[PDB]
Design a protein around this ligand. Structure first.
Ligand code: GDP
Ligand code: GDP
Ligand code: MG
Ligand code: MG
Lengths: 157, 162
């Protein structure tokens, strides 16, 4: 299923691949011939960063959902939270509802009540550190706050 | 730090990242970007099947490797492969590996004998390196018989690996 292209930088890995199929640290492509999931690594540092330890222990999560689709999308977050918990116990999560610009207040408050009650303080869900509602298509106050929360969480982990 | 962006397709994950950073599928399944602020290694998952695909079981136990070196730099590059091979071994003792020397077009005939000799006697059938299935020498920039043989080896081993 996966084809990993490894070796040192400048050896021709990306060039070889586009020729077979006929810098970014890690490039992930599908190759239909049987479909192979191809992982193109720039060098040793990038391969090392995929060790299961970093992948499962050293990660912080943005769980993103479309608020304009209403509280069922918040429900759609539960399977994600169980999966995230199973990858790591200690994985902190920030929930982000997008499409705020095309959401009603009934939806925003319902989703928040849902979040507050059903997701916010539960074992074994991950620790959900904050939640945000944003128009993801533009710069805004709320998006800048989300940006700061992501920084604060990365530093304090 | 890794930042893993998850959720279902079309929820705005890639749009949200682009906005945050301003400071077959229609979309890439997994996109991996560095974000300098502290550098965040950001992994943007299109959806559930893509996140699933990164389970450590699939990452470490369901992977075939193309181990690439520059043959115009000579037998020292074949030596450079040994650390890679120990590393691949540590992920799964069973990982199949195909070795490929590029830059054939700017290498000597002797360069290459030395590499093949080196590969043959130091890497080929060795407890515990991984399972080195084949080796090839190619100009990676063009179609060739040699590249077509490599393409075939990849199909063959992949199918055998399944
Ligand atoms: N002449 C020649 N140049 C090559 C060959 N393979 C790669 N290159 C050149 O090597 C350089 C590095 O290639 P790249 O594909 O970026 O290497 P990567 O870091 O391993 O992904 C590029 O300028 C390629 O065009 C080859 O077989 N022959
Ligand atoms: N109106 C609006 N559209 C959004 C928002 N976030 C994402 N979109 C749109 O949703 C569609 C899918 O976004 P994309 O980033 O591809 O979602 P992904 O599949 O989760 O990566 C695009 O047409 C975006 O412009 C938002 O907050 N408001
Ligand atoms: Mg490359
Ligand atoms: Mg996307």
């Amino acid at each position: 299923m996966k084809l990993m292209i490894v070796g040192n930088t400048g050896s021709g890995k990306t060039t070889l691949l586009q020729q077979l199929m006929k810098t970014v640290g890690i490039d992930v492509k599908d190759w239909p011939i049987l479909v192979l999931n191809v992982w193109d690594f720039a060098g040793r540092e990038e391969f090392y960063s995929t060790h299961p330890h970093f992948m499962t222990q050293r990660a912080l999560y943005l769980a993103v959902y479309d608020l304009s689709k209403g509280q069922a999308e918040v429900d759609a977050m539960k399977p994600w939270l169980f999966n995230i918990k199973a990858r790591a116990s200690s994985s902190p999560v920030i929930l982000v509802g997008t499409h705020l610009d095309v959401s009603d207040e009934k939806q925003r408050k319902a989703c928040m009540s849902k979040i507050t009650k059903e997701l916010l303080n539960k074992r074994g869900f991950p620790a959900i550190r904050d939640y945000h509602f944003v128009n993801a298509t533009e710069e805004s106050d709320a998006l800048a706050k989300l940006r700061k929360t992501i920084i604060n969480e990365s530093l304090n982990f």
